[PDB]
XYZ file of C-alpha atoms in Angstrom:
72
model
C 94.554 114.329 107.667
C 97.173 115.833 109.967
C 97.222 115.341 113.717
C 98.580 117.607 116.394
C 100.172 116.437 119.649
C 101.281 118.581 122.598
C 104.191 117.629 124.857
C 105.190 119.048 128.241
C 108.462 119.912 126.503
C 106.740 122.531 124.342
C 108.127 120.790 121.263
C 105.666 120.841 118.362
C 105.413 117.430 116.688
C 103.474 116.743 113.479
C 102.541 113.329 112.079
C 101.546 112.450 108.546
C 98.319 110.537 108.858
C 94.741 110.163 107.700
C 91.732 110.927 109.932
C 91.382 107.248 110.623
C 94.469 107.775 112.666
C 94.303 104.393 114.271
C 96.174 104.404 117.505
C 97.996 101.246 116.611
C 98.648 103.340 113.484
C 99.317 106.676 115.228
C 101.213 105.126 118.118
C 103.512 103.274 115.778
C 103.986 106.578 113.979
C 104.965 108.015 117.362
C 107.198 105.004 118.099
C 109.483 106.337 115.352
C 109.562 109.846 116.826
C 110.140 108.395 120.276
C 109.786 104.865 121.621
C 106.311 104.354 122.937
C 104.446 101.039 122.755
C 100.806 101.332 121.516
C 99.620 98.554 123.802
C 101.030 100.681 126.619
C 100.186 104.194 125.373
C 96.764 105.862 125.225
C 95.789 109.314 123.882
C 92.935 111.773 124.450
C 90.854 113.800 121.974
C 88.693 116.735 123.068
C 88.338 115.095 126.478
C 87.569 111.819 124.710
C 89.906 108.934 125.543
C 91.516 107.399 122.461
C 92.039 103.609 122.543
C 94.521 100.802 121.848
C 94.187 101.483 118.117
C 90.559 102.184 117.439
C 90.112 104.329 114.359
C 90.116 108.102 114.694
C 88.024 108.702 111.579
C 85.301 106.935 113.491
C 86.115 109.424 116.236
C 85.170 112.118 113.750
C 88.681 113.553 114.017
C 89.111 117.030 112.609
C 91.681 119.016 110.625
C 94.367 117.687 113.046
C 93.151 118.705 116.462
C 95.765 118.924 119.227
C 95.767 115.973 121.648
C 97.398 116.539 125.050
C 98.494 113.941 127.598
C 99.247 114.670 131.259
C 99.972 112.534 134.332
C 100.586 115.141 137.039
């Protein structure tokens, strides 16, 4: 049910979610941690690109795998 996210800051952040983890759902959860618009933010899972708020359970998300985002 948990989900792991890695930041270039090395700060470990944990979200309370279900495996459906819908990005509109996860993003909004992240909006609270830090301001990030879902319609503007996209994530990646095991090389797979997560969408605008598609469901993660459908993505067969695991025990809270770590998703990492990079732009450099």
